[PDB]
Amino acid sequence: MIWTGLLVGFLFGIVLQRGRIAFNSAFRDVLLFKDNYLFKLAVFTLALEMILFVLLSQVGLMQMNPKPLNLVGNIIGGFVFGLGMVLAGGCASGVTYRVGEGLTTAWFAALFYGLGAYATKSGAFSWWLSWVGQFKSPLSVEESAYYVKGAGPTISSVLGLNPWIPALVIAALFILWAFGTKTTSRETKFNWKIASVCLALVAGLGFITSTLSGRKYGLGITGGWINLFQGFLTNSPLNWEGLEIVGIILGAGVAAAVAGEFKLRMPKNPVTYLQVGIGGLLMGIGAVTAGGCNIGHFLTGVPQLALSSWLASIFFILGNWTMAWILFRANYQVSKEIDVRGEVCPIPDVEAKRAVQSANDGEIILVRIDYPLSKERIPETVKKLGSEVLEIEEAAPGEWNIYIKVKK
Amino acid sequence: MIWTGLLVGFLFGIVLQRGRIAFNSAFRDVLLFKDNYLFKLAVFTLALEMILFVLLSQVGLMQMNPKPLNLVGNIIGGFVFGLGMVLAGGCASGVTYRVGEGLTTAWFAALFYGLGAYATKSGAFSWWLSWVGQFKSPLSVEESAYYVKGAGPTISSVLGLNPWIPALVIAALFILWAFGTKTTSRETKFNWKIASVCLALVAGLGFITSTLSGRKYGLGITGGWINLFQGFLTNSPLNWEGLEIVGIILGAGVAAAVAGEFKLRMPKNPVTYLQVGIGGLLMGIGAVTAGGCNIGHFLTGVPQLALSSWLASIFFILGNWTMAWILFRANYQVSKEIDVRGEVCPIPDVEAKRAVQSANDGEIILVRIDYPLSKERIPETVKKLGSEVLEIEEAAPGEWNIYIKVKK
Ligand SMILES: CCCCCCCC/C=C/CCCCCCCC(=O)OC[C@H](O)CO
Ligand SMILES: CCCCCCCC/C=C/CCCCCCCC(=O)OC[C@H](O)CO
Ligand SMILES: CCCCCCCC/C=C/CCCCCCCC(=O)OC[C@H](O)CO
Ligand SMILES: CCCCCCCC/C=C/CCCCCCCC(=O)OC[C@H](O)CO
Ligand SMILES: CCCCCCCC/C=C\CCCCCCCC(=O)OC[C@H](O)CO
Ligand SMILES: CCCCCCCC/C=C\CCCCCCCC(=O)OC[C@H](O)CO
Ligand SMILES: CCCCCCCC/C=C\CCCCCCCC(=O)OC[C@H](O)CO
Ligand SMILES: CCCCCCCC/C=C\CCCCCCCC(=O)OC[C@H](O)CO
Ligand SMILES: CCCCCCCC/C=C\CCCCCCCC(=O)OC[C@H](O)CO
Ligand SMILES: CCCCCCCC/C=C\CCCCCCCC(=O)OC[C@H](O)CO
Ligand SMILES: CCCCCCCC/C=C\CCCCCCCC(=O)OC[C@H](O)CO
Ligand SMILES: CCCCCCCC/C=C\CCCCCCCC(=O)OC[C@H](O)CO
């Protein structure tokens, strides 16, 4: 039942597409823009998968296989992967679904990510991976209806508690925090509440179906890409994860075209290709070193309550923060217009607020943008700045105009 | 002596850079625009290498190693490789040296050209190659000071003659043809005559130095790429032609910057990356099938007088001609302006011809270009149409204004 990875992955892309689900931007905007929309989306799913993974394993739909603990691997590979995120312009999974979105930079970013991961795994970088392998923590769980034989450590296994107990506690706390905290609001119809339900459901669909083929794990990104490159370059048979990668690329493309969001897109300056190639290049090193990326360790490993995924997840954000500071330091009169068409995700938001605050009272400020997400984030980032959005105007195919009524 | 190829390639890039020597355009412009500048550079070098190769074989610096004849592989793969040339925006070595210039579409084309060649060699296309290999002609020469043991057939070996005779007859006919024939004029200072001298001197240096490494051949491009990818993705040792692949890029990189020609380049519309993406794939499949590319069979094999290299070099032009039809079917007032900045070199020349033809007597035509070659090819294409070029201007570094006074 190997084709089911394409089936799971096809749903995976559509959830990631219409839900804007990118983990690198989620970590960045709690540090840059104090924006938590995608964190509650993460926290909600993680809580739901916590109960889901144990519940599905309890009945007999899966067994959990936590990743083995490697402090040198989880810490250092976690940080290397965090750097690649901001350099690659998106997470490991985010770039993959971005390929079907028509992002030439995502093609370039994905091309090196698989190659470097291949090189880190078996290629010329295999010395650095084999050296880190001398820090493998031998601590293990034992075979049960919960855990595969010889798997890694968990919160439960250390504590001697039955896995239900921390899973019910932590998920409830997360559900409390996400439901009890103020949220920065956008205008995505596939809002973070329902979107987390689908994301956890597909993950549960991922675990049960992938285990049938022989792969005892949920959603993964690095393992599939390496399997794709191998099959194309050494004629090895494709498996569930590589097919899942294929379904993701198709899945994001289908919805992007149905919504009318699809476009072959170029960066504003040609130097960005050199940047995003390095970004994925780092990600291949870090993801392979840590044993998984923002999906293989975070989305699918954190709700499994596994120490190795929990430890590796930490430095995903440290690198996400580290590379962020290095890098990111109708007739309506219009008083000043600023053109941000062709700019990557944070730029339209960054220069829109730089216009209204460096403007007097009563200014009409025009914002010209050609990317879908920015027309939903800009209206919120100006309401707290006192001002008001006059009208969101639809100009050319895929371009929107925002007129701002500046206050004080 | 593996390192000598980076040196040979380093010279190779500078020769290819300042002479603009791309074989895909050499074949293309004899059918499109009846322009023979680059073919003149080709035929002379073939003659010079016809004499050079046999001369060095006589003393003991080298031996000729013609590639064995396979009628299925040379014809079909040669045709397909010709399709990939036009699609990939240039020949096999024609993108590689262009990587050092700063062209992002060549980086994309290089990514698919290498990976397809690795796939067609041992990856997912090994079935096609394994089937094609059953048609290998068992005609072999014998170990001698002129031919390596069990090599392929040649014009000389077929006729029962000494290698000097066909080399001295065919090269003189090439030399007589090139010098007695009309040549389309350019303003490349590194003219076709001297550049043909240096291109054989590098080619001969490639033979003598590489033969000591254990590879008994001169400049070969597709074989070089696979050695790099094997090393990077399988931790295999690099080799002479793998280093030669690097030296071409590093050699052109030095030459592209000193002349002030370096610039990170993007196409006009994002669609070109997918078009050039297929081009590298076709070239990899074609070059591995053909057993040699624009350099492996034409530049290096044709002067060796080998039957297989001639046969594949016939169909390189047929596929080049096939795909060419599918794809291509200051105070000066200025009366009409034409902007072709960012479009590949044929387009500025063609769109400059379209303006003058659809212009009346006395109109001043402004043509803005951002590629150095077009500022050389346009002035000859304007005097051919009766008109006169007024001044070549320097707007921005790397951008030129061409002012044309049209006659009738
Ligand atoms: C603030 C949160 C709001 C929502 C809250 C939802 C709570 C759901 C579960 C809680 C478990 C609490 C601890 C229960 C301990 C039970 C121990 C047990 O059954 O066994 C103990 C021993 O280890 C073997 O017998
Ligand atoms: C017990 C086995 C399962 C354990 C795991 C699942 C736990 C689900 C519940 C968590 C808290 C949900 C309610 C959180 C508060 C929601 C409403 C809110 O934010 O405040 C409303 C206010 O308290 C009044 O008006
Ligand atoms: C645990 C067992 C699970 C078994 C079942 C597995 C699959 C579950 C859900 C899949 C939803 C896939 C489609 C999600 C919705 C598509 C996107 C959407 O809602 O788009 C709205 C649009 O953006 C408005 O403008
Ligand atoms: C063993 C001895 C024989 C084997 C080795 C023979 C090497 C022959 C040439 C090497 C590099 C030539 C590079 C091209 C010349 C310099 C670049 C040039 O021509 O630049 C002109 C410029 O464009 C004006 O503005
Ligand atoms: C990892 C590298 C992956 C590389 C490949 C990723 C997927 C590319 C998908 C679509 C582009 C081709 C279709 C869109 C072409 C431009 C749109 C257009 O002009 O119209 C097309 C439409 O079909 C009316 O004819
Ligand atoms: C027990 C589990 C309970 C939950 C199981 C969920 C399974 C998936 C169902 C629906 C996906 C989301 C569908 C709704 C998303 C928004 C659709 C919408 O607004 O559509 C607008 C329209 O397409 C243009 O105007
Ligand atoms: C091998 C097993 C099969 C694998 C392959 C199956 C392909 C099925 C195709 C399409 C269905 C899903 C289409 C989902 C389209 C996105 C939803 C959406 O956005 O539509 C509403 C719109 O946005 C409002 O403006
Ligand atoms: C338009 C441009 C056209 C350019 C020219 C294209 C010529 C045909 C090329 C490839 C198809 C090959 C199909 C047949 C392949 C071999 C059939 C066969 O017997 O394959 C056995 C197999 O390899 C083990 O079982
Ligand atoms: C035994 C054989 C030994 C062979 C050893 C190598 C011989 C060839 C070396 C150089 C050729 C000329 C190179 C190009 C020189 C002219 C460049 C030109 O046209 O102009 C350059 C000038 O700097 C513009 O300002
Ligand atoms: C796997 C294969 C790897 C192959 C690797 C080969 C070596 C590196 C290649 C080319 C370097 C080219 C460098 C060109 C630098 C140009 C700098 C320049 O001119 O920059 C202008 C700018 O204005 C300044 O601020
Ligand atoms: C002035 C414009 C250019 C400025 C500089 C641009 C960057 C140069 C860096 C490296 C180039 C490659 C050469 C150095 C490395 C060669 C490969 C090597 O070390 O090979 C070892 C061994 O022979 C096989 O593994
Ligand atoms: C491994 C690290 C490598 C670091 C980098 C090493 C650079 C070597 C320097 C010079 C060789 C090439 C000399 C220049 C050849 C082309 C000259 C040129 O541009 O000729 C036109 C002329 O300048 C118009 O006035």
PDB file of C-alpha atoms in Angstrom, chain A residues 130-309:
ATOM      1  CA  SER A 130      29.129   9.298  11.252  1.00  0.00           C
ATOM      2  CA  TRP A 131      31.046  11.300  13.875  1.00  0.00           C
ATOM      3  CA  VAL A 132      27.803  12.524  15.473  1.00  0.00           C
ATOM      4  CA  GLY A 133      26.641   8.901  15.670  1.00  0.00           C
ATOM      5  CA  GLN A 134      28.951   8.241  18.635  1.00  0.00           C
ATOM      6  CA  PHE A 135      26.563  10.255  20.858  1.00  0.00           C
ATOM      7  CA  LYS A 136      23.532   7.970  20.448  1.00  0.00           C
ATOM      8  CA  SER A 137      21.735   7.737  23.782  1.00  0.00           C
ATOM      9  CA  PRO A 138      21.024   4.002  24.263  1.00  0.00           C
ATOM     10  CA  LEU A 139      17.935   4.668  26.398  1.00  0.00           C
ATOM     11  CA  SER A 140      14.905   2.944  24.912  1.00  0.00           C
ATOM     12  CA  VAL A 141      11.274   2.059  25.523  1.00  0.00           C
ATOM     13  CA  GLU A 142      10.001  -1.501  25.088  1.00  0.00           C
ATOM     14  CA  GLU A 143       7.546  -3.125  22.690  1.00  0.00           C
ATOM     15  CA  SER A 144       3.896  -2.571  23.584  1.00  0.00           C
ATOM     16  CA  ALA A 145       0.648  -1.464  21.995  1.00  0.00           C
ATOM     17  CA  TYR A 146       2.123   2.048  22.383  1.00  0.00           C
ATOM     18  CA  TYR A 147       5.762   1.775  21.292  1.00  0.00           C
ATOM     19  CA  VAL A 148       7.723  -0.152  18.686  1.00  0.00           C
ATOM     20  CA  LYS A 149      10.530  -2.330  20.032  1.00  0.00           C
ATOM     21  CA  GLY A 150      13.715  -0.441  20.840  1.00  0.00           C
ATOM     22  CA  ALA A 151      12.363   3.032  20.073  1.00  0.00           C
ATOM     23  CA  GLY A 152      13.603   6.253  21.655  1.00  0.00           C
ATOM     24  CA  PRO A 153      12.712   7.955  24.935  1.00  0.00           C
ATOM     25  CA  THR A 154       9.565   9.885  25.861  1.00  0.00           C
ATOM     26  CA  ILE A 155       8.167  12.002  28.678  1.00  0.00           C
ATOM     27  CA  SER A 156       6.130   8.930  29.643  1.00  0.00           C
ATOM     28  CA  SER A 157       8.919   6.331  29.612  1.00  0.00           C
ATOM     29  CA  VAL A 158      11.161   8.438  31.852  1.00  0.00           C
ATOM     30  CA  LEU A 159       8.327   9.083  34.323  1.00  0.00           C
ATOM     31  CA  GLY A 160       7.042   5.498  34.454  1.00  0.00           C
ATOM     32  CA  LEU A 161       3.547   6.809  33.654  1.00  0.00           C
ATOM     33  CA  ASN A 162       1.206   5.369  31.057  1.00  0.00           C
ATOM     34  CA  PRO A 163       1.396   7.469  27.860  1.00  0.00           C
ATOM     35  CA  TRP A 164      -2.236   8.561  28.178  1.00  0.00           C
ATOM     36  CA  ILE A 165      -1.480  10.587  31.310  1.00  0.00           C
ATOM     37  CA  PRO A 166       0.926  13.268  29.964  1.00  0.00           C
ATOM     38  CA  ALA A 167      -0.906  13.220  26.620  1.00  0.00           C
ATOM     39  CA  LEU A 168      -4.255  14.130  28.194  1.00  0.00           C
ATOM     40  CA  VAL A 169      -2.626  16.731  30.469  1.00  0.00           C
ATOM     41  CA  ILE A 170      -0.447  18.539  27.922  1.00  0.00           C
ATOM     42  CA  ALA A 171      -3.059  18.579  25.151  1.00  0.00           C
ATOM     43  CA  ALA A 172      -5.665  20.034  27.521  1.00  0.00           C
ATOM     44  CA  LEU A 173      -3.243  22.745  28.661  1.00  0.00           C
ATOM     45  CA  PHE A 174      -2.478  23.590  25.024  1.00  0.00           C
ATOM     46  CA  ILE A 175      -6.198  23.687  24.229  1.00  0.00           C
ATOM     47  CA  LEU A 176      -6.611  25.998  27.229  1.00  0.00           C
ATOM     48  CA  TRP A 177      -3.772  28.290  26.164  1.00  0.00           C
ATOM     49  CA  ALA A 178      -4.741  28.504  22.493  1.00  0.00           C
ATOM     50  CA  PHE A 179      -8.452  28.995  23.285  1.00  0.00           C
ATOM     51  CA  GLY A 180      -7.796  31.315  26.246  1.00  0.00           C
ATOM     52  CA  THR A 181      -5.192  33.608  24.649  1.00  0.00           C
ATOM     53  CA  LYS A 182      -5.669  36.597  22.367  1.00  0.00           C
ATOM     54  CA  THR A 183      -4.875  35.846  18.716  1.00  0.00           C
ATOM     55  CA  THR A 184      -3.494  38.091  16.003  1.00  0.00           C
ATOM     56  CA  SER A 185      -6.213  37.905  13.357  1.00  0.00           C
ATOM     57  CA  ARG A 186      -5.938  37.470   9.592  1.00  0.00           C
ATOM     58  CA  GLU A 187      -8.492  36.871   6.831  1.00  0.00           C
ATOM     59  CA  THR A 188      -7.865  33.250   5.839  1.00  0.00           C
ATOM     60  CA  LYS A 189     -11.145  31.383   5.357  1.00  0.00           C
ATOM     61  CA  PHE A 190      -9.427  28.113   6.335  1.00  0.00           C
ATOM     62  CA  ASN A 191      -8.966  29.508   9.833  1.00  0.00           C
ATOM     63  CA  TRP A 192      -6.543  28.043  12.359  1.00  0.00           C
ATOM     64  CA  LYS A 193      -9.247  26.209  14.331  1.00  0.00           C
ATOM     65  CA  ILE A 194     -10.679  23.967  11.603  1.00  0.00           C
ATOM     66  CA  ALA A 195      -7.307  23.817   9.825  1.00  0.00           C
ATOM     67  CA  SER A 196      -5.647  22.138  12.819  1.00  0.00           C
ATOM     68  CA  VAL A 197      -8.378  19.471  12.826  1.00  0.00           C
ATOM     69  CA  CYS A 198      -7.606  18.562   9.214  1.00  0.00           C
ATOM     70  CA  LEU A 199      -3.848  18.665   9.805  1.00  0.00           C
ATOM     71  CA  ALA A 200      -4.052  16.256  12.752  1.00  0.00           C
ATOM     72  CA  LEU A 201      -6.497  14.006  10.889  1.00  0.00           C
ATOM     73  CA  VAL A 202      -4.163  13.667   7.898  1.00  0.00           C
ATOM     74  CA  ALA A 203      -1.312  12.961  10.324  1.00  0.00           C
ATOM     75  CA  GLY A 204      -3.399  10.156  11.803  1.00  0.00           C
ATOM     76  CA  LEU A 205      -4.176   9.074   8.259  1.00  0.00           C
ATOM     77  CA  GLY A 206      -0.433   9.304   7.656  1.00  0.00           C
ATOM     78  CA  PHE A 207       0.575   7.117  10.598  1.00  0.00           C
ATOM     79  CA  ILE A 208      -1.889   4.268  10.024  1.00  0.00           C
ATOM     80  CA  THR A 209      -1.346   4.074   6.269  1.00  0.00           C
ATOM     81  CA  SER A 210       2.438   4.506   6.308  1.00  0.00           C
ATOM     82  CA  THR A 211       2.748   1.741   8.908  1.00  0.00           C
ATOM     83  CA  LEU A 212       0.911  -0.589   6.513  1.00  0.00           C
ATOM     84  CA  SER A 213       3.620  -0.215   3.858  1.00  0.00           C
ATOM     85  CA  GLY A 214       6.309  -0.879   6.477  1.00  0.00           C
ATOM     86  CA  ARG A 215       7.276   2.685   7.419  1.00  0.00           C
ATOM     87  CA  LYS A 216       6.370   3.068  11.107  1.00  0.00           C
ATOM     88  CA  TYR A 217       6.148   6.853  11.211  1.00  0.00           C
ATOM     89  CA  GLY A 218       3.867   9.741  10.352  1.00  0.00           C
ATOM     90  CA  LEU A 219       4.580  12.671   8.068  1.00  0.00           C
ATOM     91  CA  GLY A 220       8.152  13.254   6.964  1.00  0.00           C
ATOM     92  CA  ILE A 221       9.931  15.520   4.494  1.00  0.00           C
ATOM     93  CA  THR A 222      13.647  14.705   4.490  1.00  0.00           C
ATOM     94  CA  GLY A 223      13.201  10.939   4.248  1.00  0.00           C
ATOM     95  CA  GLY A 224      10.987  11.274   1.182  1.00  0.00           C
ATOM     96  CA  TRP A 225      13.253  13.654  -0.736  1.00  0.00           C
ATOM     97  CA  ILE A 226      16.315  11.472  -0.159  1.00  0.00           C
ATOM     98  CA  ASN A 227      14.296   8.477  -1.357  1.00  0.00           C
ATOM     99  CA  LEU A 228      13.200  10.408  -4.461  1.00  0.00           C
ATOM    100  CA  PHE A 229      16.737  11.430  -5.449  1.00  0.00           C
ATOM    101  CA  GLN A 230      18.014   7.908  -4.815  1.00  0.00           C
ATOM    102  CA  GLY A 231      15.304   6.340  -6.976  1.00  0.00           C
ATOM    103  CA  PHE A 232      15.966   8.753  -9.823  1.00  0.00           C
ATOM    104  CA  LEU A 233      19.758   8.462  -9.528  1.00  0.00           C
ATOM    105  CA  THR A 234      20.300   4.808  -8.536  1.00  0.00           C
ATOM    106  CA  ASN A 235      16.974   3.363  -9.781  1.00  0.00           C
ATOM    107  CA  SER A 236      15.866   2.438  -6.265  1.00  0.00           C
ATOM    108  CA  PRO A 237      12.161   1.732  -5.690  1.00  0.00           C
ATOM    109  CA  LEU A 238      10.099   4.662  -4.463  1.00  0.00           C
ATOM    110  CA  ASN A 239       8.460   4.293  -1.064  1.00  0.00           C
ATOM    111  CA  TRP A 240       5.722   5.919   0.995  1.00  0.00           C
ATOM    112  CA  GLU A 241       7.589   9.077   2.032  1.00  0.00           C
ATOM    113  CA  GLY A 242       8.860   9.905  -1.447  1.00  0.00           C
ATOM    114  CA  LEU A 243       5.350   9.356  -2.762  1.00  0.00           C
ATOM    115  CA  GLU A 244       4.123  11.569   0.074  1.00  0.00           C
ATOM    116  CA  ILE A 245       6.523  14.257  -1.163  1.00  0.00           C
ATOM    117  CA  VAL A 246       5.004  13.871  -4.636  1.00  0.00           C
ATOM    118  CA  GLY A 247       1.473  14.170  -3.267  1.00  0.00           C
ATOM    119  CA  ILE A 248       2.458  17.334  -1.401  1.00  0.00           C
ATOM    120  CA  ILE A 249       3.763  19.013  -4.560  1.00  0.00           C
ATOM    121  CA  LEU A 250       0.609  18.030  -6.437  1.00  0.00           C
ATOM    122  CA  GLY A 251      -1.577  18.881  -3.453  1.00  0.00           C
ATOM    123  CA  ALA A 252      -0.383  22.466  -3.078  1.00  0.00           C
ATOM    124  CA  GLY A 253      -0.571  22.980  -6.844  1.00  0.00           C
ATOM    125  CA  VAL A 254      -4.183  21.805  -7.164  1.00  0.00           C
ATOM    126  CA  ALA A 255      -5.614  24.194  -4.571  1.00  0.00           C
ATOM    127  CA  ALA A 256      -3.367  27.095  -5.606  1.00  0.00           C
ATOM    128  CA  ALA A 257      -4.817  26.853  -9.117  1.00  0.00           C
ATOM    129  CA  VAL A 258      -8.422  26.263  -7.999  1.00  0.00           C
ATOM    130  CA  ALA A 259      -8.316  29.349  -5.782  1.00  0.00           C
ATOM    131  CA  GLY A 260      -6.604  31.188  -8.645  1.00  0.00           C
ATOM    132  CA  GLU A 261      -3.460  31.753  -6.575  1.00  0.00           C
ATOM    133  CA  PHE A 262      -1.011  29.989  -8.907  1.00  0.00           C
ATOM    134  CA  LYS A 263       1.749  31.914 -10.665  1.00  0.00           C
ATOM    135  CA  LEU A 264       5.278  31.219 -11.857  1.00  0.00           C
ATOM    136  CA  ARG A 265       7.058  33.768  -9.674  1.00  0.00           C
ATOM    137  CA  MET A 266      10.548  35.277  -9.714  1.00  0.00           C
ATOM    138  CA  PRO A 267      12.287  37.162  -6.889  1.00  0.00           C
ATOM    139  CA  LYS A 268      12.884  40.881  -7.230  1.00  0.00           C
ATOM    140  CA  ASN A 269      16.669  40.607  -7.301  1.00  0.00           C
ATOM    141  CA  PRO A 270      18.565  37.747  -8.987  1.00  0.00           C
ATOM    142  CA  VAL A 271      20.887  37.361  -5.986  1.00  0.00           C
ATOM    143  CA  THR A 272      18.012  35.682  -4.121  1.00  0.00           C
ATOM    144  CA  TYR A 273      18.603  32.441  -6.045  1.00  0.00           C
ATOM    145  CA  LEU A 274      22.082  32.225  -4.528  1.00  0.00           C
ATOM    146  CA  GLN A 275      20.596  32.798  -1.068  1.00  0.00           C
ATOM    147  CA  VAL A 276      17.775  30.254  -1.273  1.00  0.00           C
ATOM    148  CA  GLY A 277      20.099  27.609  -2.699  1.00  0.00           C
ATOM    149  CA  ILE A 278      22.288  27.926   0.392  1.00  0.00           C
ATOM    150  CA  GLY A 279      19.214  27.933   2.620  1.00  0.00           C
ATOM    151  CA  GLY A 280      18.075  24.499   1.516  1.00  0.00           C
ATOM    152  CA  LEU A 281      21.710  23.389   1.474  1.00  0.00           C
ATOM    153  CA  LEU A 282      21.922  24.077   5.208  1.00  0.00           C
ATOM    154  CA  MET A 283      18.531  22.426   5.774  1.00  0.00           C
ATOM    155  CA  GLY A 284      19.699  19.153   4.254  1.00  0.00           C
ATOM    156  CA  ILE A 285      22.616  19.129   6.687  1.00  0.00           C
ATOM    157  CA  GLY A 286      20.546  20.091   9.719  1.00  0.00           C
ATOM    158  CA  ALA A 287      17.491  17.937   9.023  1.00  0.00           C
ATOM    159  CA  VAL A 288      19.577  14.805   8.407  1.00  0.00           C
ATOM    160  CA  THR A 289      21.740  15.558  11.451  1.00  0.00           C
ATOM    161  CA  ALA A 290      18.744  16.063  13.757  1.00  0.00           C
ATOM    162  CA  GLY A 291      16.886  13.057  12.321  1.00  0.00           C
ATOM    163  CA  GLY A 292      13.949  15.100  11.032  1.00  0.00           C
ATOM    164  CA  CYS A 293      12.818  18.590  10.151  1.00  0.00           C
ATOM    165  CA  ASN A 294       9.910  20.862  11.165  1.00  0.00           C
ATOM    166  CA  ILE A 295       7.570  17.942  10.342  1.00  0.00           C
ATOM    167  CA  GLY A 296       9.545  14.781  11.079  1.00  0.00           C
ATOM    168  CA  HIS A 297      10.521  16.086  14.529  1.00  0.00           C
ATOM    169  CA  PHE A 298       8.129  18.944  15.321  1.00  0.00           C
ATOM    170  CA  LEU A 299       4.668  18.295  13.882  1.00  0.00           C
ATOM    171  CA  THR A 300       4.882  14.494  14.089  1.00  0.00           C
ATOM    172  CA  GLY A 301       7.430  13.969  16.880  1.00  0.00           C
ATOM    173  CA  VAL A 302       6.407  16.570  19.477  1.00  0.00           C
ATOM    174  CA  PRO A 303       2.846  15.181  19.979  1.00  0.00           C
ATOM    175  CA  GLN A 304       4.497  11.776  20.330  1.00  0.00           C
ATOM    176  CA  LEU A 305       6.042  13.335  23.479  1.00  0.00           C
ATOM    177  CA  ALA A 306       9.488  12.013  22.520  1.00  0.00           C
ATOM    178  CA  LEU A 307      12.554  13.593  24.125  1.00  0.00           C
ATOM    179  CA  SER A 308      14.669  13.546  20.952  1.00  0.00           C
ATOM    180  CA  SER A 309      11.980  15.345  18.961  1.00  0.00           C
TER     181      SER A 309
END
